[PDB]
Design goal:
Three copies of one chain form a homotrimer. Chain A is α/β, with parallel strands linked by helices. Chain A has a single domain (1-167), classed as 3-Layer(aba) Sandwich (Rossmann fold), CATH 3.40.50.450. Helices cover 31% and strands 18% of the residues of chain A. The first copy, chain A, has helices at 21-33, 65-81, 96-107, 129-134, 141-144, and strands spanning 8-13, 38-42, 84-90, 112-117, 126-127, 137-138, 165-166. In chain A, the strands form two sheets. Chain A has a five-stranded parallel beta sheet with strand order 2-1-3-4-6, sandwiched between helices. A two-stranded parallel ribbon of chain A has the order 5-7. In chain A, strand 3 (84-90), helix 3 and strand 4 form a beta-alpha-beta unit. Chains A and B meet through loops of A and strand 2 and helix 2 of B. The structure holds 3H-imidazo[2,1-b]purin-4(5H)-one (2 copies). The site of one 3H-imidazo[2,1-b]purin-4(5H)-one has 5 residues of chain A, from helix 2.
Chain lengths: 167, 167, 167
């Protein structure tokens, strides 16, 4: 039914190194900010843990175990707090972090919205079975990105992945 | 304590074919709508998934696997998002869907409010052990239905099933 | 990133026998009430279940199984509804109830804020490995209690236990 207050709490999973990825994430953020069903959005790369004992940290890049633990746990906490996952999913460069997180959320029985992106529509349209069956809602990033502004995250209606060859 | 905003998110479980069942559901919805502790109510039958490749689908009839998956997942998603379950539970015609959902929610450690209905109070008062022990709060549907309007769904105080013979 | 509404739902775990304990709980409650990230706070001892069939029940005495079940379940329900745990943790008299609840919440992947108190700073600073590693954020109760008023419970940033000997 119609929610009295917004209840949607989104875990936004995405790689964040290159341009386009960062641009995708930013646009996703604005779109979600326009959605009246959303109470909160968590994006892992926004904040960050600082290890006082960590000298000259990179990103390459050997990191302290304290930093690793704190950041990983910040992400798991984000998944725990979240009601649903929204993943900006690069089909050209598969991100195993995002896949890990999708599997994690599905094991918790939480709904997962997959938002796939490709710069090669001329190439074969294929998906790993675990992703294709694991995700509960697909919203195409190249053609339907704008739907993130209107999607009812209070209820997260299903939309099974179809039209992808499956391996 | 007193909630700053309503936090109650209800999964409302009930069969929805017959008259009476539908009436029960409607009254339940109104009562819950009057409750200030509730942020959201999900009722499985309100919306629906439409499989484009499904021609002339019948309730009770053979359904496509896509529709089955999407609908089942819509319910599981509702259970996931919910903080608690409220089941309009017909003691005269046992619904195994509702029982399934009760078990699912209890396995997730979520509280379950059972709202039993009978058209034969003069008849034997008996309940299956898994339901009687599984549910955390009982509110009699014939005599206490109205309590759905005032019950504090921010905290869901317990009220164990008593007065039922157990098999 | 920034919440549209507060989403923090706190399970406040603490013993409630001594005046010192009750005072800690009270101050904690007041501090949390000032936190704009918090939607709701649950404290187990605030309310109570009353077993009509229980004659002259005594705190610390033999309790009816109905009371035991209902009360235990009220706590588990509090943990279920909660997004995170905040534990007023007496390092001088270890409370196994609170520890139980911490383990329960961590098994559910929920974040746990430990707020340790000691009146014997002269003694060695030691912690059980399961508590030190189980907890996701430590806020010292003796020196940093007030931080409960400002902490962002929408996201619950990590802060690993350091400075304690580990046994
Ligand atoms: O720096 C990060 N690398 C990274 N790989 C996977 C998740 N994350 C993550 N979340 C927050 N910061 C980071
Ligand atoms: O609500 C309670 N929770 C709880 N955990 C451990 C003991 N207790 C306790 N004793 C009386 N009421 C309670």
């Amino acid at each position: 039914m119609k929610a009295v207050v917004p209840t949607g709490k989104i875990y936004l999973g995405s790689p964040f190194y290159s341009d386009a990825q960062r641009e995708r994430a930013a646009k996703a953020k604005e779109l979600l900010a326009k959605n009246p069903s959303i109470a909160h959005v968590f994006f892992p790369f926004d904040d960050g843990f600082t290890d006082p004992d960590e000298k000259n940290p990179e990103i390459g890049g050997i990191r302290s175990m304290v930093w690793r633990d704190a950041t990983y746990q910040n992400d798991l906490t984000g998944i725990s707090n979240a009601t649903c996952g929204v993943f900006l999913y690069d089909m050209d460069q598969l991100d195993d972090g995002s896949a890990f997180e999708i599997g994690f959320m599905r094991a918790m029985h939480k709904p997962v919205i997959l938002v796939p992106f490709t710069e090669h529509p001329e190439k074969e349209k294929k998906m790993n079975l675990m992703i294709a069956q694991g995700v509960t809602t697909i919203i195409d990033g190249n053609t339907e990105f704008e739907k993130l502004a209107d999607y009812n995250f209070n209820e997260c209606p299903s939309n099974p992945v179809r039209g992808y060859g499956i391996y």
